[PDB]
Structure formats: structure tokens, C-alpha cells
Amino acid sequence: DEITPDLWQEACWIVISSYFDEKGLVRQQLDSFDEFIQMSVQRIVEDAPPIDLQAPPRYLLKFEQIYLSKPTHWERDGAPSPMMPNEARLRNLTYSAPLYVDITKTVIKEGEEQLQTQHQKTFIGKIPIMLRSTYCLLNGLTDRDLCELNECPLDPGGYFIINGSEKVLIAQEKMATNTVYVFAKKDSKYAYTGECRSCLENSSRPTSTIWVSMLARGGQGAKKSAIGQRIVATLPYIKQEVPIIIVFRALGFVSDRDILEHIIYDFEDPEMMEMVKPSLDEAFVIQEQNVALNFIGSRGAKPGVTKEKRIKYAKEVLQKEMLPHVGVSDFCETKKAYFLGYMVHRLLLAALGRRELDDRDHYGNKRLDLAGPLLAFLFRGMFKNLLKEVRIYAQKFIDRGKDFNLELAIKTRIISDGLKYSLATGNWGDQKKAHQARAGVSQVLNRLTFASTLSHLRRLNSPIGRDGKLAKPRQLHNTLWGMVCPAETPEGHAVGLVKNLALMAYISVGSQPSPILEFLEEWSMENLEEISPAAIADATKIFVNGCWVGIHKDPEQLMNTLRKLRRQMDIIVSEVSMIRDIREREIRIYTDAGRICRPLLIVEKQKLLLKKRHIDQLKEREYNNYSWQDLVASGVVEYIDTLEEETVMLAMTPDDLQEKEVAYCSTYTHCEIHPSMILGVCASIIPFPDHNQSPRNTYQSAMGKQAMGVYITNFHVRMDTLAHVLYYPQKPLVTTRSMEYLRFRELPAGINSIVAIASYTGYNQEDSVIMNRSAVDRGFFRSVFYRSYKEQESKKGFDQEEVFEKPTRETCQGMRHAIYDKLDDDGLIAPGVRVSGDDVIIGKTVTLPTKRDCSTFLRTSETGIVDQVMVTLNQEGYKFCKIRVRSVRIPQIGDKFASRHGQKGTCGIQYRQEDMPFTCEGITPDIIINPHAIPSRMTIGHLIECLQGKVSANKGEIGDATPFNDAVNVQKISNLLSDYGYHLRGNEVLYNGFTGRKITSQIFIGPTYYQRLKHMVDDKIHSRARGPIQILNRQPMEGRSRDGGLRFGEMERDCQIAHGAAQFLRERLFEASDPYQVHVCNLCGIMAIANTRTHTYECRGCRNKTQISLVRMPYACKLLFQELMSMSIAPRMMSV
């Protein structure tokens, strides 16, 4: 019937519950990969031209179908077997599926006889498989089945296992292609610049960009000033800018009227006509298409020997290299002329001020490249290489007159290794061409926390380089609403550049625009090639994926028809964006991938199409087959992208904005399912985030990624390099509705703690924390640190090999002061053996060309117990051993602890229960935080959570801290607390533990959810006292793990200079780093040869050995002078 406001809160979260029950949280990752395997791989193979050999017999090869099998592993004996994801992680294998293709070989022998043979399912390489994808072994497995495979059901997948490393492809943000964007450069010579990054359908040969720019008026001249500003075009493969009018002439439009007809659609407008006049004068000399073509060819990529070549080359560039998305055929000149004129027309509007300049920060102008589009780009090159070598291999055999074996022509390494390398290293492209390769695309999945794992799978990477600095890209653009978390973003050089998807935000996987184009032709849309230029003025331009297809004289009806079709899912899929620019008389239809969209409730006549019946059907989501997709089919909820959002009049809530009230907006098109969905995975776990200062919310987002807990249920089976496990994780007493979908209850990353905000002994000042020693003794925030050491014995060389054994101090050459007794006869320590610093866990010896020692030494700080010792064969077939060392981390002084409100703090001191202050009931706070942390930070949500937590614990009900919930108020929480015999404001009378006297001020105390952060003092404490030095500089090593020395940087050097401490500055920079001695000739300041054993010092060059001076200088200074000498310089140290 209709959802009343009293039931709306339940109704909307039922809708949200269904969405996640179906979509999950890594849908964009899985859907993108599914599209790539299912469609892109086949499309790329099909789109490949048949290979033709002629050198006489003629051989043709065509790749018909693509076949993919389950991820398979081959044992050293050659027996295939299914590769479970856990096995790959343990044995450092790559989770890849064999790839097979049907190839048809037809040979023409000039005897009028054709022989055709098909090589069915020809192996052509292996494709890494995204976990839990349609082609993954875990696909379609019930939670029970996953447990039987040692796989966590809560694991969302969406990542690749390359050599056992879980790799996640970060969504790469880029400007939308095929779209005309006009920007103004204040400093550049061009007043305005209209660019369009045109790319082929299905992402063929990479994007080609064309710039149409208007020259700035800065140039002063009698002729330049009078004419005004001229427009030039920067075509690809052309060194110099080409006047725009020349390009139109090269296209086949010579008369000014014809050219102006494609640029100016209404000659009745005189202002626009005057703008193009200077451009016409510039190209007045060229009055023929061939002359225009020759002119362009003159600036071609390579010089043209003759005019005919120049014209041919110029036609080649225009035909395909210019506006390829518009067309790549020889009959597309008219289509490109219209689009090129539109670009000019768009530029004129910007110059005339009639149209606002495009915003680069607008994400309607942005696309996110997911694994699918990412992988497809790689596969196109690898497949082209595969065919290139196939042609090369076949050419050699056909040239000799012998037929060629098709199987032997295929090099499977091309695809198998190329895909693996890009994911393995993250360098995007080719290993040889790493200079232009995009880096950071692939990252090792973060397993610190489940929320951290989830966040890494929903991360977004901005195109701007991290090294470069620019506020605008780092700013929180308005278009980020509902698409990207406004709070989750790293602090430092990456602020505003690395982003995370909003909770319901979805990225379009893309589809073919053919059904839409066919419907448009069927509808009363006039084709661009059939209309006259005069008719464009009144009609509205129709753009499909950035291609101007035609015009329509009834835009309103067409949009309604298009909207009806998409809501009914008849011809238009859900992820298709239909944008009508009423002012600009343009309808833009987008169907490509990378478009960010979120589901929104449809509103008609100020009424939600979502009624009580839909809620009731959803309530029985199971045993009813009613799911979220039914809501989309029902047409009550639809996905809206950023571009379409501009044209959408949206209601924050139906309970208030739809209801009759003071007339503000009587025409609402959509409504939020819930305003809290604008937050991401990490921002969604903040309680009362609408009561905290925004920077705090961001800080918690980062902190939550570092909170200990249970990052995964099957952590025991896993052998990760680092892993932190909390003994007693607790679900927050005060939670948020979104937390149900993050599985935070299933994998909590904190403990609800009795926190008192008081100044007790000054040991919690300045973001420091006082912890309860007795509580810690009971396992409070106690955690495990798991560290895995992997060692491989490999034999490579004529007589060099590595083995696992106990290296005897006499037998082996290399040795250290560590202890080798723990090692077993097989060179591997046993599980359950206590191990401390300077202990050998793996005994590895390499034969000397008797044998050197390459044994693995346990981390000096680490002191744990060998947990697991796994031995197997790695992906290379060599003996492979992984050893897990378990160390228990009891919270100490200095260990970082944070709330869910950005209030991080190390443990300043630990007091026993008797020493801690207590209430009348004997309750002592587990943690005490300084009151001074609250005022400046204004983390009011922290106080509310403490108050709500007190009610939750006493009432026995988990508190709700959904940000925008009018049903929850501090007064409401305070009133509830009064019912339980406590001060309504959460204050209690506390007694000094040392004296037992009542504290004059009553202390704000209550349960608060804190989290132990990965940063532990014992992992950071480092001391150096005459440690090892590096070979190049002979200075203290670098890194805590290397016992390196702290850097005494320039600022420290500068500081001591102000101090005037010359000797200490000398100590730090000379004595404590690299004291060195050199012998220098007195005649020449060059270093002399010194033989202390023979007591002979000579200067080769001065023929003297009697007057040599010993100089005490830093070794680096010696290296500098020596390095300078390498550049022919002569730094002559003179002692006189």
C-alpha cells in the first residue's frame, strides 16, 4: 500500500539488506573480471585478423572459440590436478586457469584444392583467476563446502594469488573517453582547449586524443588583434598544430558555408559567426581537399618523400588516427566532420561564455578501470604477440617449403608470463617497456584486518601522480556523494588521491550499445548522415557512448520512453546512463564500463514506487525467491551514475522531504535508500560519525585498517608474513546498521572497554592512555603476532646447490654468533621450540665454488615459539619450507590504542586494579584517557558512544549509532541511563585507588569500543652502537631489521650549528658515522698510494714519496672526491 514514516526505518534497511545479500561488497571486482573472461577474451581473439601466410601455398589461421578450464596445477610427474586457493598460498603457486582456443587451418596449394583442419582446444597459455569468480573453484560452493577446503566463507574473494601472493587490482581513475571537454589554461598560449580522448569500441588500439584550441589574445598586432583569436587542432602524429579549417578541407568540405554548417547550426546567430572568421582567414590559402591533405601530411610522423605519399599518409591519419571512436572506415568523413564541428561548436560556446567550462574533478567525466578493462588491455598485446610469433614461426617453415606444426608455433609463455608478471609486480604494461608502465595498479592484499581487507578491495586510485602536488584533485568534490567515501582517505602525500567506494556504490561493467542504437533508429530519431545541417538547431543531439548518432525533435518523449525501458529492463540494462541536457539540447547515453553508479529509489508524483508489499516480499527474502534484482525489475529502484545525478532531483528521506510542508521542491525524481550509505567500509564502523569533526572520521578510517582482531576465520591454515590475532575480539556494544553487512560481528577488531575520561596521574596526558594492569593480566587486548619465514633450496649452476641441513662451524665457511642447536637433522627447526633473537630457524648451506652459510636468522626483537613448519614444493618444483613463529603480545607501555573516533593513544602506564580509581560498585576503568583529548578534537560521538554503551550494557541491547538517525538523541540516551540507577549524563563518583577518597569531580565513565593497533613499541624500539656499515659509503646500515643507524639529516646538522656544538656535530657527522684516513700528496692535493705494511707512500704523478700528509676525513668525502675525479675534476686537498 504505502510505507508510513513509523515503518520507514525498518523498511529501508530491509532494502539495503537485500542489496548486500545479493551484490556483496566486492561485486565490482568480480563482475569486471567475469566480463573480461566471458566477453573480452573471446572478443579479442575473434577481433584478431586471420593470419595469412604466402611464401605458392597459402596458409590461413583463424581462432574460433576460447575454452577455459578450472585452475589446474601440474605435479612434477606431469599429472594435472585442481589447484585449491589454499594450496597456491602455501606452495607459492599462481592461481591460473589453462586457456585453450579452437584454431582452423586452411591451406591453398594453387591446385584448386582447399584443405581445412581445425585444432580444437589449442592451449595458448594460462589466465590468473580472480578468487570466488564465476570461473573460480570456490564459485557456487556453499559455506560448508568452503570450510572443507580450508577457505573462509566470509572471504569476499576478488583478488588474485600470484606465486602465493594475494594481489588486488586497484581501480584506476581516468578521464572518460570519447567525450568533448573544454578547459581554459591561464598560462598556456591557448585561451581555451577542447579535447576528446577517442577510443575504439571494445578498447582496441589505445586511446587517441585530439585537441581543439583557441589561441590566446596575448599576441599583439595590427592583423592579429583585428581578426581576433584563431582555432587550431592538434591531431595525433602531427608535430605542429593544424588550423581547424584545414582539417575540414582535408575531410572533403571546402566551401565556407559547408564548413560553417557543421560548426554553426544557426547562422542567425552573429556572435558565433564572428568567432570563426579569423580561422577562415588562416586557411584561406588552402581551398582544395588534396591541398589540405598534403599540408597535414607535411607535418606527418615521418617526412613525405613525395606529395602522393604525403596525401596518402594524411588521409590515413584522418581516416583512423583522428576521432577513431567516431569511425575508422573510409566513409566516416561526414560523421567526423560533424563531431569535429561539434568540438569547435563546444569551444565557441566556452569562448562566448554560453557554456560553462568542463570540470576535471567532476566524476561524470571520469572512469574507473577495473580488473576486467585492465586485464583486457594486457591480453590484447599478449595475443597480438602470440600471433606475431606464430606468423614468424610459420614464415620460417613455409619459406623452406615444409608445412608447419601449429602447436609448435604457439608460445604459451607469452600470455601466461605476461599476465603473471603484470599482476606479480604491479608494473602495468610490458617488462621491457616499464618506463611507461603504470605502477601500483596491483598491490598485495592487506590482511591486517577484515575491514582493511574489504577496504583494499574497494580502493580507488586517482590518475594524478603521488609525487605531484595539486589541491584540486585532492579536494572532496561534490560529485563524490553516494559514490565514494567522503572520510576514508590516506593522510600524507596521498590525501584525496586514493579513495574508497561508497557502501552501495557500483561500477558499471559495460555492455554493447547496439540494442540502444537499433531502438533509436526504430524510434523517431533522424540519422546524422541523412539530415541537413539546418535541422540541427531545433533538434537535440543524441550521443551514445560519446558518439553523435543523430538528432531528435521530441526529446521529452524519447527520455520517458528510454527511462521506461530501463526500469522495465526491456532493451536498456540497469547500468545504462541516460542524460538529457535540456539547456544544451543534448541527450547523452552511456553504456561503457568504469561508470560509478548507486541504486536510488524512484519517486513519482512525490510518492515512492516502493510500497509495503515490496517490503513484505523482501522480509521473506528466503524461501520466496524475492531478491534485490526484483526491485530493479519492478522499476521501484534504479542505478544512477554521476552524470545522470546532475539531472536528478533527489530526496534525502521520504518521511520528511516527500511529505507536504513549506513549498521547497514539489518535483522529486529519486530518494536515498539511506543517507548513511555515503560512507565506505571503514567509515561505516564509526559510531555517531555525524557528531565528530570530519578530520577525526578520516583518522579513524585509517586507524580501523590497523586494528587487530581476526582478519579471517581460517587464519590458522594460512601462513602469512605478518598476522595479528586478538584473543578476545568483541562486537561493539554500540554498533551501526551498516556493520551487519561488513561482517564486523563475525570478525570484530576491538574490545568494549570501561573507559574513564579523567586526569588521574598525568600518565595519560598528550594522547597517552592509562591501562588496567589487572585487566591486561586477564587477556584484555592480549594479541598474537604471527610471522612466517619462507626459505627455498634451489640448485642452479654447474656445481652450485642449496640444501637444508645443520651447518657445522667447521664444514661451512660462513657463520654467525647465533645458535644453530635448535635446528633438526633436516636443517629445519621443530614446531613448539622457543626461539629468541639471533636464533637459526632454517639451516641453509650453499656449496662453495667448502660451503657458505645462508641460514635464516630469527628477527632479533622477535621472541616467540615455532608454530608451524610446512615443507612442500614451490611453483618452481624446489623443496619449499615455511615456518610460522608465534609470539604473544601482552599490551605494554607505548602500545597504540584508539577509539572509533580518531582518538589514538599509546599506553602511558599500567596500574593494578587496586591502584585504579573505582566506583561505589567496585568497577575500575579498563582505560583512562585525558579529558584534554576531547575539546580540541571535538569527538562528541566518542562521548555519545560511551553514554550509549553504558545504556547498552545495562539494558542488554546492542546500541545503534547510525549517523543520521533522529530516533536516537543524547537526551533520549540520557533518559534511558537514568532508569538504571546512573547519572543521566554518564558521570559517576570515583574513589582514588591510592587513598580511597572520593574524587571531587565526578568522572565520565562508560563502555567504549577501543582497538589495539598494529604499532607495538617492541616492534619499533631500536638501538645502534657500532653496528655494521654499508659497502658503498662505509656508513651505518639502514633499517631497524638491519641494525642500521639513525639518520643525522641536514636539519639535525643545521640544529647543532645553531647550538654551536661544533665537536658534537663533528662526532655525529665524522666520528660516529665513517671515520676514515687518507694519504695526500703535499705538492698535489690528490690522494697518494699508502703501503702501511711496507711504510712506503708514493704519489704516482709527482714522482715524490717523502712529503705525504695523512688526512682524517669522512669516507663519504673520499668517495665524493674519487667520484668527482671520475668526472675529470681535480679536488686538490691542500694542507697549506
Annotated binding site for Zn(2+): 1081-1084, 1099-1100, 1102
Q: In the range 847-906, which residues lie near other proteins by CB under 8 A? A: 848-849, 852, 854, 873, 875-878
The C-alpha cell 578450472 sits at 70
Footprint (CB under 5 A) of Zn ion, residues 140-169 = none
Strands (E), 481-527: 498-500, 506-509, 525-527
Q: How many residues sit close enough to Zn ion to count as binding (CB under 5 A)?
A: 5
Residues 387-416 that bind other proteins (CB under 8 A): 407, 411-413, 416
Could you say which residues in the range 751-810 bind other proteins, by CB under 8 A?
751-754, 756-762, 772, 774-775, 778-780, 794-798, 800, 802
Alpha carbons 744 and 450: distance in angstroms, whole number: 8
Residue 1046 phi, psi dihedral angles, 5° rounding: -65, 140
Q: Sign of dihedral through CA atoms 88, 92, 93, 95? A: positive
Q: Is 1102 in the site for Zn ion (CB under 5 A)?
A: yes
Question: How many residues in the shown chain lie near other proteins by CB under 8 A?
Answer: 170
Cβ neighbors of 258 (< 8 A, separation 6 or more) are none
Separation CA 676–CA 963 (nearest Å) = 6
Closest CA relative to residue 698, chosen from 935, 973, 900: 900
Q: Does 1064 interact with other proteins (rule: CB under 8 A)?
A: no
Q: Which residue of 68, 434, 909, 970 would you call a contact of other proteins, by CB under 8 A?
A: 970
Q: Taking CB under 8 A as the criterion, which residues in 228-257 touch other proteins?
A: 255-257
Residue number, 484 or 1099, with CB nearest to Zn ion:
1099
Site for other proteins in 462-481 (CB under 8 A): 471, 475, 477-479, 481
Grid cell, residue 165, equals: 601472493
The radius of gyration computed from the CA coordinates of the chain, to the nearest angstrom, equals 35
Catalytic residues: 767
Q: Which of residues 568-587 bind Zn ion (CB under 5 A)?
A: none
User: Which partner in other proteins, Zn ion, none is near 1102 (CB below 5 to 8 A by kind)?
Assistant: Zn ion
Residue among 702 and 953 whose Cβ is closer to other proteins: 953
Query: Is 620 a residue that touches other proteins (CB under 8 A)?
Result: no
Partner that binds at residue 1081, options other proteins, Zn ion, none, CB closer than 5 to 8 Å by kind: Zn ion
Q: Which residue stretch of 10-18, 444-452, 821-829, 935-943 sits at the interface with other proteins (rule: CB under 8 A)?
A: 935-943
Stretch that binds Zn ion, among 828-836, 960-968, 1065-1073, 1091-1099 (CB under 5 A): 1091-1099
The cell 576486467 sits on which residue?
Answer: 372
**Separation CA 150–CA 211 (nearest Å):** 55
CB of 354 or CB of 1059, closer to other proteins:
354
Tell me which amino acid residue 340 is.
L
Which three cell numbers, joined as nine digits, stand for 41? Answer: 577474451
- Give me the half-sphere count of Cα atoms (radius 13 Å) on the Cβ side of residue 83: 32
Residue 1026's binding partner, choosing from Zn ion, other proteins, none, with beta-carbon cut-off 5 to 8 A by kind? none
In the bound complex, what is the minimum distance in angstroms from residue 654's beta carbon to other proteins?
13
Residue nearer to Zn ion on the CB measure, 468 or 922:
922
Bridge partners for 166 per DSSP = 161
Residues 6-25 that bind other proteins (CB under 8 A): none
Give backbone dihedrals phi and psi of 200, rounded to 5 degrees, phi first: -70, 155
Contact indicator for 992, 999 with CB cutoff of 8 Å: yes
When asked if residue 662 is in the footprint of other proteins (CB under 8 A), the reply is no
Indicate which of Zn ion, other proteins, none lies near residue 362 (CB less than 5 to 8 Å, by partner kind): other proteins
Is residue 148 involved in binding other proteins (CB under 8 A)? yes
Subset of 101-130 contacting other proteins (CB under 8 A)? 123
Residue 1099 binds Zn ion (CB under 5 A): yes
Cβ proximity of 510 and 593 under 8 Å: yes
Q: What's the closest the beta carbon of residue 88 comes to Zn ion, in angstroms?
A: 46
H or E stretch covering 172: strand 171-175
Does the protein bind other proteins through residue 156 (CB under 8 A)?
Answer: no
When asked if residue 1081 is in the footprint of Zn ion (CB under 5 A), the reply is yes
The CA-based angle 969-758-1016, given to 5 degrees, is 100
CB 414 within 8 A of CB 125: yes
Q: Residue 1052, interface with other proteins (CB under 8 A)?
A: no
Q: Phi/psi at 1128 (nearest 5 deg)?
A: 75, -5
Identify the burial level of 81 via C-beta atoms within 10 angstroms of its C-beta, where 0-12 means exposed, 13-18 middle and 19 or more buried. Answer: exposed
Cell 607459492, residue located: 92
The DSSP output letter for 136 is: S
Treating both helix axes as pointing N-terminal to C-terminal, what angle do 27-35 and 371-399 enclose, rounded to 10 degrees?
A: 20
Q: 3-class DSSP state for residue 1030?
A: coil
The stretch among 307-315, 628-636, 674-682, 1074-1082 that binds Zn ion (CB under 5 A) is 1074-1082
Nearest to 758 by CA among 924, 892, 904, 977: 924
Q: Closest approach of Cβ 772 to other proteins, in Å? A: 8
Answer for which of 80, 219, 1075, 1101 binds other proteins (CB under 8 A) is: 80
> Any residues with CB less than 8 A from the CB of 669 and at least 6 apart, and which?
602, 603, 648, 649, 650
Stretch near other proteins under the rule CB under 8 A, chosen from 4-12, 449-457, 512-520, 842-850? 842-850
Q: Does 280 help bind Zn ion (rule: CB under 5 A)?
A: no
* Minimum distance from residue 563 beta carbon to Zn ion (Å): 26
Residue 174's Cβ-side half-sphere holds a number of Cα atoms within 13 Å equal to: 19
Q: Map the footprint of other proteins across residues 980-1039, applying CB under 8 A.
A: 983-987, 990, 992, 994-995, 997, 999-1004, 1007, 1031-1032
958 binds other proteins (CB under 8 A): yes
One-character DSSP codes across 898-938: E-SSS-EEEEEEEE-TTTS-B-TT----SEEE-TTHHHHHT
Q: What is d(CA 500, CA 456) in angstroms, rounded to the nearest whole number?
A: 8
Question: ∠ at Cα 90 (88, 92), nearest 5°?
Answer: 55
Q: Which stretch binds other proteins (CB under 8 A): 189-197, 326-334, 1043-1051, 1119-1127?
A: 1119-1127
Q: Which one of 98-106, 648-656, 928-936, 1080-1088 is the stretch in contact with Zn ion (CB under 5 A)?
A: 1080-1088
Question: Which residues make up each annotated binding site?
Answer: 1081-1084, 1099-1100, 1102
User: Is 280 an interacting residue with respect to other proteins (CB under 8 A)?
Assistant: yes
- Residue 641 binds other proteins, judged by CB under 8 A: no
Helix (H, G, I), strand (E, B) or coil at 739: helix
Q: Which residue of 258, 1019, 1043, 1052 would you call a contact of other proteins, by CB under 8 A?
A: 258
Report which residue's Cβ sits closest to Zn ion: 1081
From other proteins, Zn ion, none, interface partner of 956 (C-beta below 5 to 8 A by class): other proteins
Q: How far is the CB of 586 from Zn ion (least distance, A)?
A: 25
Residue 752 interacts with, from other proteins, Zn ion, none (CB under 5-8 Å by kind): other proteins
Residues 431-450 that bind Zn ion (CB under 5 A): none
Q: Which does 994 bind (CB under 5 to 8 A by kind): Zn ion, other proteins, none?
A: other proteins
Nearest to 920 by CA among 978, 977, 1002: 1002
CB nearer to Zn ion: pick between 451 and 953: 953
Question: Which of other proteins, Zn ion, none has residue 322 at its interface (CB below 5 to 8 Å by kind)?
Answer: none
Per CB under 8 A, the list member of 669, 965, 1082, 1109 interacting with other proteins is: 669
259 binds Zn ion (CB under 5 A): no
3-state secondary structure of 255: coil
For residues 192 and 350, is the Cβ–Cβ distance under 8 A? yes
Do the Cβ atoms of 679 and 503 come closer than 8 Å?
Answer: yes
Q: Determine the interface stretch with other proteins among 318-326, 609-617, 707-715, 1064-1072 (rule: CB under 8 A).
A: 707-715
Residues 6+ apart with CB under 8 A from 382: 125, 414, 415, 418, 419
Cα distance between residue 263 and residue 260, in whole Å: 5
Contact residues for Zn ion (CB under 5 A)?
Answer: 1081, 1083-1084, 1099, 1102
